[PDB]
Design a protein around this ligand. Structure first.
Ligand SMILES: [Zn+2]
Ligand SMILES: [Zn+2]
Length: 85
């Protein structure tokens, strides 16, 4: 003769879908129209503007771009300049 018994247990698995998302959201600095996603440009100053205000003048740019880049030109007075022979 004889006898005996016992017990058992269990436990469910643990896990979580760790997702992550992050995208840049740019937008004209003048008016404030979305540009990042699409229609984005850079100005001599750096500020990001829209295709409509992408040009410096468009937003009365401040950056001094006189040395490197110009539009209006004038003829200098008549000089002899002996430099040349
Ligand atoms: Zn704009
Ligand atoms: Zn500018």
């Amino acid at each position: 003769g004889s006898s005996g018994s016992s017990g058992i247990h269990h436990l469910p698995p643990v896990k979580a879908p760790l997702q992550t998302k992050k995208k840049i959201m740019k937008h004209c600095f003048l008016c404030g129209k979305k540009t990042g996603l699409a229609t984005s440009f850079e100005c001599r100053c750096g500020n990001n503007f829209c295709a409509s205000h992408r040009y410096a003048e468009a937003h009365g740019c401040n950056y001094d771009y006189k040395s490197a880049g110009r539009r209006y030109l004038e003829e200098a007075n008549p000089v002899s300049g002996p430099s040349s022979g």
